[PDB]
């Protein structure tokens, strides 16, 4: 874009290339994408997670691995990248390993696949936590499409995926992820 302010003065623009920034970044930087209102994505190292929100309790505390301390996540996976990315995400979103409720992951001994689950239901005794979590997501995902409705059950699941090729590259999410973690 451009237009004339005066006779010899021009309004001009410069637009940075996200393709250029991402593809030519020699560092292994974390990417966070909002594909649409329901599906979010995060990538770090060899780990790539799809994040989804809905009322399905994929994991249950009676059968799956309770995570109170980051080291517990050693039982969630055989890939150090998956564990590292999960810990990094829970840190960046504001989860307090000391005071907040433990979350859940699937024991790596099972073969259904890697997945971890966080109760973000905005209801009852969980409301405060949910709210905090919401705020966290708002910092990590620009224009965060909050799917969790007040008073309703809402569980976040993060599971392995391939990076959507149509994912809008947004470096602001990366800056917030690096800043908050």
């Amino acid at each position: 874009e451009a237009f004339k302010i005066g006779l010899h003065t021009e309004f001009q623009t410069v637009s940075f290339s996200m393709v250029g920034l991402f593809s030519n970044n020699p560092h292994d930087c974390p990417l966070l994408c909002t594909l649409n209102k329901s599906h979010l994505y995060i990538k770090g190292g060899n780990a790539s997670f799809q994040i989804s929100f809905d009322d399905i309790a994929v994991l249950l505390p009676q059968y799956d691995v309770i995570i109170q301390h980051p080291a517990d996540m050693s039982w969630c996976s055989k890939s150090d990248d998956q564990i590292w990315l999960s810990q990094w995400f829970m840190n960046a979103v504001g989860h307090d390993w000391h005071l907040d409720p433990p979350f859940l992951c699937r024991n790596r001994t099972k073969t259904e696949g890697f997945i971890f689950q966080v109760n973000t239901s905005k209801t009852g005794v969980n409301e405060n936590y949910a709210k905090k979590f919401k705020t966290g997501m708002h910092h990590l995902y620009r224009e965060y499409p909050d799917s969790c409705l007040n008073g309703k059950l809402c569980l976040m699941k993060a599971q392995p995926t391939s990076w959507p090729l149509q994912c809008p590259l947004d470096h602001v999410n990366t800056l917030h992820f690096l800043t908050r973690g």
């Epitope: 309790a57 259904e112 997945i115 599971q159």
Partner: antibody, heavy 128, light 109 residues
């Protein structure tokens, strides 16, 4: 068309206790290497039973078994032949049943062991 | 320690066009991690329901299901002759996966 067809590799389904027996399950109509495969069995007058599962290459062909067969049965797969196999050793009369191979996929966006396709069944009778 | 899937009614009678309900009670809480299957003549089962209430592609809309925790119900509306079969539940929340003993749907006369 998605197909799962079972057979007894060697001999018939009638075997004597202590013998061995390999079941096969050949498939087509889908990318076999992207799906986990299961073996189950329906004993006479008893409810359907899960036996074993084997996952894909990206997860090191990991396998899980029920306790009653651990150390006796071995699930395996050949992706180049789109086939899954159940090798049953140390057979006892309690192993008599109709054995099924099955496929599980992804359900409402999440992997879970609901069985969306099954083989036709293979009758196995362990008797002296 | 296995989760028992209890179907206490082994046989159930109905007439074509009726609505019928087949129940399943798990001995442990399994959330909605439940599937429902149809089976005839001890042949290959057919998947009907997963996550307790989601209808599988290709299943008639006569079939619905619901429930949670321990109590799950499969409902067949406008029962058709071809719906006469065994019906059984399954939990896949924990190993070993386990199935109900089955409820056989039969015709009234």
């Amino acid at each position: 068309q998605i197909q799962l067809v079972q057979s007894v590799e060697t001999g018939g389904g009638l075997v004597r206790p202590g013998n061995s027996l390999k079941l096969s399950c050949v498939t087509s109509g889908f990318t076999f290497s992207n799906y986990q495969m299961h073996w189950l069995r329906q004993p006479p007058g008893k409810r359907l039973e899960w036996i074993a599962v084997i996952t894909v290459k990206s997860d090191n062909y990991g396998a899980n078994y029920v306790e009653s067969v651990k150390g006796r049965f071995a699930i395996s797969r050949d992706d180049s032949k789109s086939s899954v196999y159940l090798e049953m050793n140390r057979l006892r009369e309690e192993d008599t049943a109709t054995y099924f191979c099955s496929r599980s996929g992804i359900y409402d966006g999440y992997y879970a062991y609901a069985m969306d396709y099954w083989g036709q069944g293979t009758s196995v009778t362990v008797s002296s | 320690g296995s989760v028992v899937m209890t179907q206490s009614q082994k046989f159930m009678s109905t007439s074509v066009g009726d609505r019928v309900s087949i129940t399943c009670k798990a001995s442990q809480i399994v959330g909605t991690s439940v599937a429902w299957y149809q089976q005839k003549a001890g042949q290959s089962p057919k998947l009907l329901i997963y996550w307790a209430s989601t209808r599988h592609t290709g299943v008639p809309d006569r079939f619905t299901a619901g429930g949670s925790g321990t109590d799950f119900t499969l409902t067949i509306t406008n029962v058709q002759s071809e719906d006469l079969a065994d019906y059984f539940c399954q939990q896949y929340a924990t190993y070993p996966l386990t199935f109900g003993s089955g409820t056989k749907l039969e015709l009234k006369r």
